[PDB]
Every structure is written in C-alpha cells, then in structure tokens.
Amino acid sequence: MIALSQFNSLSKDEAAGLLAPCVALPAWGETLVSLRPFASRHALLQTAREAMANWGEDELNAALSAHPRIGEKPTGSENERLAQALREGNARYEARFGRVFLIRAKGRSGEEILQALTRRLQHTADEEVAEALAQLREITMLRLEGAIGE
Description:
Order of helices and strands: HHHHHHHH
Largest sheet: none
Strand content: under 5%
Shape: elongated
Distance between the termini: 10 Å
Oligomer: monomer
CATH class: Mainly Alpha
Radius of gyration: 17 Å
CATH architecture: Orthogonal Bundle
CATH superfamily: Oxo-4-hydroxy-4-carboxy-5-ureidoimidazoline decarboxylase
Number of strands: 0
Structural class: mainly alpha
C-alpha cells in the first residue's frame, strides 16, 4: 500500500501500473490517473466508482479474458459435499455462459458462494451479465482500497 500523496506524484505510467491489478481494464486506470491529484482517499474512491459505473458486456469480457477456467490449474463428509457442489456448479456455469464464475468472495462462506452460484445459474444471459459486472465492480473496489492509503 502506498500513500495517496505518492499516488498523486507518480508518473502517469507508474500510476497506471499501480492500478492495473485492480481490474484488467486499462481505460479505467487511465481515467483515474488522468484525474489526479486526488485530495482524499474517499474522493478517489468516489471517482473510481463513477469511472466503473457504465462498464458493460465488452468490459466484462475484456476484464475476464485471461482468467483461468476449470481444469486450467491442475493440481495433480460435509466438506466433500460442499467442495463437490462448488466444483460442479462452476462447471455448469462455465458450460452455460462461456465465462468464469466471478464473485466477490471475501466475507462470504463457501456455503454462501454455493448459494449465489446456484441462484445465478437460473439467470438469463442478460441478468447474469449484470450480476457478473456488479461483482467485478465490487472486487475492483476492494482491490483499490488495499492499494492506496490516506
């Protein structure tokens, strides 16, 4: 984590690089960088929310393009039932929608994630683009909050 004053004084390229892990959408970071200086962390976060408010399906696709799918990271009881149901739900999700299951995980239990996954599998394509975007916005904000201090 770097101070807000450090973020304000970075070069445009170092500042975009600091923001890059928050989401794989260079335009979002470029926009925030171009609006420096920020006078408080709260104001930076509010601007960040505005900048992602009109992301659509094209941004969802670009943001997720390098995300590993099922079977792409081979590793070589109630816990077993949960792990199985989560792995099966993820497999169903990828087969239906042709994209990884994106969910803000911090703060949710495995059982809560399973319930959200099961519910989202009942969505229409448009309903799920919207929810996946909302989760992408939440994740981006949590990452930004860990990247730049007061």
